[PDB]
Design an enzyme around this catalytic site. Structure first.
Site, short mmCIF file in Angstrom:
data_model
loop_
_atom_site.label_atom_id
_atom_site.label_comp_id
_atom_site.label_asym_id
_atom_site.label_seq_id
_atom_site.Cartn_x
_atom_site.Cartn_y
_atom_site.Cartn_z
N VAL A 8 69.50 40.37 98.63
CA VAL A 8 69.75 39.71 97.36
C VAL A 8 70.69 40.59 96.56
O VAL A 8 70.58 41.82 96.59
CB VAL A 8 68.43 39.44 96.59
CG1 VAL A 8 67.63 38.33 97.26
CG2 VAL A 8 67.60 40.71 96.46
N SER A 9 71.63 39.97 95.86
CA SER A 9 72.56 40.70 95.00
C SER A 9 71.84 41.27 93.77
O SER A 9 72.09 42.40 93.37
CB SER A 9 73.71 39.80 94.57
OG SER A 9 74.45 39.34 95.68
N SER A 10 70.95 40.46 93.19
CA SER A 10 70.21 40.88 92.00
C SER A 10 68.72 40.62 92.16
O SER A 10 68.30 39.86 93.03
CB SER A 10 70.74 40.16 90.76
OG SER A 10 70.05 40.57 89.59
N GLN A 13 67.19 37.08 91.44
CA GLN A 13 67.11 36.16 92.56
C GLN A 13 65.71 36.20 93.15
O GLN A 13 65.08 37.26 93.22
CB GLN A 13 68.14 36.50 93.63
CG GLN A 13 69.59 36.34 93.19
CD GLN A 13 70.58 36.66 94.30
OE1 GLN A 13 71.28 37.67 94.24
NE2 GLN A 13 70.66 35.79 95.30
#
Lengths: 124, 122, 122, 124
Positions: A8-10, A13
């Site tokens: 996950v990028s952040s 999420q």
């Protein structure tokens, strides 16, 4: 065995969902990584997951986009697991690895599906 | 119910197998005909008028249904509008390849259209 | 002639670029609108009623034309029946990828349908 | 330079047409072989053509089916020419190698086209 990979990028999420899906689909261990899928060079955890999996194991992800957002690098990974004889499953595409007495098409399906998705992931 | 369709333009083809493969998957009826066009194929039209919502139109392969990319797509569209589930005996499970209803539809359209262009250029 | 179409559901999008990319390829007119459905998009309907045989309907991308696999295919079908050449500015040359008119049609259908399923699931 | 490869199962097949197309599209030399496209092991001429072509050269055929009727072996050949940096052209698909400012799709096109055709060839 069954190894999963979650990315996950952040943290905003839904990482929990992703982990639950991997677990539900049989994830024994899950290499979790907080990083972009633009490149693999900056994703050492992926390198660990790919190195850990061995002949006979299963490598699972929720989606191709989780594996990466780079058509070239993604296709490179899909062939790596083939050559290493590790089965790549996509929990969102559970029946993609299913057999249907047409080895030709079946293989041709994956090649299409995976290449479509690998592109989509990059373009997004 | 389950409905089949078979075609052989000439006098020298294994029409028996074609009829036996349809029966295998559960073909209750078969509209056999003796594929460059549909205007000269009424047996097909009868098979299309028979099938109603809930039924299953089946062939052995898309080339049987016709050898014209334009017409072969028009008929698959017809069966869909009529809510008749099209299935190919040589390509079972074509419906759900991955499980994702989004790709299933896409691929269905894809394989059919591959088979259609092949049926024509042959 | 050449006709364009632009859409932006909200108040915060680079609508200027979208209008400038259409003009770039030769858009003479642009039906700009402010994509979950077509029933609530009359500006699109006006763009479709305007275009006649010989014209060229253009967008920046298929997601502009709509974010619904079902509806996006129905409209590409409409433009075809009406003999209006659809072109995407971000995907020029989509018409003739290989040269073989057989694959050109197939791929056109393929890329469009890829873009359509993407436009929806996003 | 431009090397072509022509194959026909029988002499009743229009071999002259094939050779003329290759020539027309710039064939300097044409490795002609009378053999089935089912396998490469029984096609030594193909092995010569593939070995002869070198970085910078062009390897041309009228169609994929001429290159082979084996999805696996065909894809193996297409990647061989890539790795060897030899450009594969198909005279029946002249614009397949043309550039259109979308390296992603362009590459993705070929992958699709070639994989579709490689399958078709085998199934026939």
């Amino acid at each position: 065995m069954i190894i999963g990979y979650a990315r996950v990028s952040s943290l905003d999420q839904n990482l929990e969902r992703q982990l639950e899906n991997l677990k539900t689909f049989g994830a024994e261990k899950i290499f979790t990584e907080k990083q972009s899928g633009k490149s693999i060079e900056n994703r050492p955890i992926l390198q660990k997951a790919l190195n850990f999996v061995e002949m006979g194991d299963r490598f699972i992800v929720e989606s191709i986009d989780r594996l990466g957002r780079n058509y070239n690098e993604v296709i490179h990974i899909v062939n790596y697991l083939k050559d290493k004889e590790v089965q790549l499953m996509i929990t969102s595409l559970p029946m993609m690895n299913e057999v249907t007495g047409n080895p030709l098409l079946d293989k041709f399906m994956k090649d299409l599906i995976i290449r479509i998705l690998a592109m989509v992931s990059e373009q997004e």
